Amino acid sequence: SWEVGCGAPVPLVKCDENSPYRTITGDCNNRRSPALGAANRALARWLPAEYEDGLALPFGWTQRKTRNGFRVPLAREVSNKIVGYLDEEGVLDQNRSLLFMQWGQIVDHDLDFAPETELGSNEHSKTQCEEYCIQGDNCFPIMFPKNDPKLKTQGKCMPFFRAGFVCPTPPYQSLAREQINAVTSFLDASLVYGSEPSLASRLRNLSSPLGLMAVNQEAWDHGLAYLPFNNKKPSPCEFINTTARVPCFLAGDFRASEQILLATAHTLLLREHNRLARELKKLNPHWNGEKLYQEARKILGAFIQIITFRDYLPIVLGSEMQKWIPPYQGYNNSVDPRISNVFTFAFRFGHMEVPSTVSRLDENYQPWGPEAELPLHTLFFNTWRIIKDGGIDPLVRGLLAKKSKLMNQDKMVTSELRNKLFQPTHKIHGFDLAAINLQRCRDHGMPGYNSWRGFCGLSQPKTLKGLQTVLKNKILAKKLMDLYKTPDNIDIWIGGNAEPMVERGRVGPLLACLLGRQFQQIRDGDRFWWENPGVFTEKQRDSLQKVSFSRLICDNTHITKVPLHAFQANNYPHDFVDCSTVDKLDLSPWASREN
Ligand code: HEM
Ligand SMILES: *[C@@H]1O[C@H](CO)[C@@H](O[C@@H]2O[C@H](CO)[C@@H](O)[C@H](O)[C@H]2NC(C)=O)[C@H](O)[C@H]1NC(C)=O
Ligand SMILES: *[C@@H]1O[C@H](CO)[C@@H](O)[C@H](O)[C@H]1NC(C)=O
Ligand SMILES: *[C@@H]1O[C@H](CO)[C@@H](O)[C@H](O)[C@H]1NC(C)=O
Ligand SMILES: *[C@@H]1O[C@H](CO)[C@@H](O)[C@H](O)[C@H]1NC(C)=O
Ligand SMILES: [Ca+2]
């Protein structure tokens, strides 16, 4: 027997089936199996889960219990000995702009979100976890090793709560624990519109019938829109500067304000929806509000797909791209489009691409004022620097003109994220994203590094010398052996990211495999993929292949000079051209005559 029975919180709807538009939840994409790839279902498992008790407890929960005969090393200790470095000189990617990093986070937020178990506020378990580092139920603390400076300064532990899971969330249920994906698995701009009907409707402007999204009423960026403010107090974005009291932004995805460049990207997309809707009204004065919203929505979703598959993936995957993602042959209704649990850790390669500072540049692409360059840690949940300190254009220019960090085996994750991460629930700039990622691998029941190497048809090193050869690094292999004892025990997040990069790419072979298969599936298993015959007309498709990120900047900012290939490293002024040189999106193929 399978167990396709269980499935409790879900939002079930009736499928229209002749609708030319996606649902908000992702239901009804697959006609035979309507819940496939919908939000608020379990992440898929390409391999069976690996928990300490076979069902739900993570490896490292019970100290007595080993993994393959060895204790698993503390997440924070792996972080200290392997992931950290001091010297930011020499660490930048010479042929990837900052936007390369930032597009990755957008795509990843469209595809997956496994929220923490909540149980609501008004609980003393949030105190008990934070205050006393007491493991149990959903509290699974990251303990500091001996000689950690955070011991002196912070406490015994970083609090950490286990991820939510399907059926029930309070008393559990049986078998193997399966984490939830709270967004739609399809690349569909769910991060802009929401993955739930409640939220999607709240994001819309339903006073006017122009199919527009709601915009801020308290603040303008030289007459351009800002996202609306989120309702909710306590607001993490006002906590970081109680004098400015600028709240977080409200968007289709809950993490939109996590850092300032993510909020910036979200603002561009909202702007583009409104631009598109008002252009479509011009051409089709008879279209109602709904039709404008959906039709703009459909274009925007196609834009994300195109940028992602044409410009971004080839420069992640490099020479592996063709091997995993062959040319499109049409919609395949037998393909599983769901995001897999392991993908949500594979795609965290981006954490190693984040540099330590962010810049604001002026109209000649020069430092914008005296405090132009800011440490990244001051910009988590920071909206006041947008509203009170220049709007988005200076941040957008920095995206274009500055570089991503290069993954480096000796310099993996900046300290801005490794020691000074801010979490919305808590009050300190003191968390470790690397340690959280490792702890989360265990929370989610990840098989180890060698299981995934075998999955991908790659060799499985068993010795120090085997690991040296795969990593092509003696010192890194040895530090890994001293902590983990067997390469079978190496957590997937760090194992995958430790491999040298493939030719023309920015991930290694294991990751290229994991990423590559996932992206093949969400393309092939999507009935509304933009090239799937009948989704758009030939002439609409012809118009859509001219989109570029550069054009999106030009249309939705006051920036006049942009590069043509925004993801590669570009110098000002030589690589910068005037916006009037950049191909526009021609919307005349959306004109709808009567007679
Ligand atoms: C300054 C930039 C960024 C910050 C501050 C940030 C922060 C975070 C945080 C706090 C989490 C939750 C971790 C957990 O509890 O397990 C997370 C998850 C994630 N991050 Fe990032 N990150 C950033 C950039 C990126 C980039 C560039 C990518 C990809 C290219 C990325 C991909 C992801 C993914 C896939 C997850 C898992 C989401 C899920 O399914 O729940 N991140 N990140
Ligand atoms: C919903 O859309 C309407 C119509 O576009 C917005 O109202 C206009 O917005 C500008 C800026 O606030 C004003 O100068 C006009 O007074 C408004 N025009 C009309 C015809 O009402 C409205 O702000 C939108 N609402 C939200 C929350 O975004
Ligand atoms: C930068 O990357 C682009 C796009 O992947 C590539 O074609 C170009 O040759 C690269 N530049 C350098 C200097 O290697
Ligand atoms: C708080 O914001 C105000 C402007 O609202 C600014 O002048 C001040 O620097 C900010 N303080 C901090 C500590 O970020
Ligand atoms: C569609 O996908 C299935 C399962 O992944 C695969 O075996 C088959 O080759 C594909 N079928 C078609 C008709 O392309
Ligand atoms: Ca989605």
UniProtKB/Swiss-Prot annotation:
Catalytic activity: 2 a phenolic donor + H2O2 = 2 a phenolic radical donor + 2 H2O; thiocyanate + H2O2 + H(+) = hypothiocyanous acid + H2O; iodide + H2O2 = hypoiodite + H2O
GO cellular component: basolateral plasma membrane; cytoplasm; extracellular space
Binding site for heme b: D108, E258, H351
Biological process terms in GO annotation: antibacterial humoral response; defense response to bacterium; detection of chemical stimulus involved in sensory perception of bitter taste; hydrogen peroxide catabolic process; response to oxidative stress
UniProt site (Transition state stabilizer): R255
Tissues in which the UniProt entry reports expression: Mammary gland; milk.
One function term, GO molecular function aspect: calcium ion binding
Regions that span the bilayer: none
Cofactor descriptive note: Binds 1 Ca(2+) ion per heterodimer. Binds 1 heme b (iron(II)-protoporphyrin IX) group covalently per heterodimer.
Enzyme Commission identifier(s): 1.11.1.7
Keyword Oxidoreductase: yes
Modified residues (3'-nitrotyrosine): Y365
Needed co-factor(s): Ca(2+); heme b
Residues reported to bind Ca(2+): D110, T184, F186, D188, S190
Chief localisation class: secreted
Family that this chain belongs to: Belongs to the peroxidase family. XPO subfamily.
Protein name stated in the entry: Lactoperoxidase
Organism: Bos taurus
Underlying gene: LPO
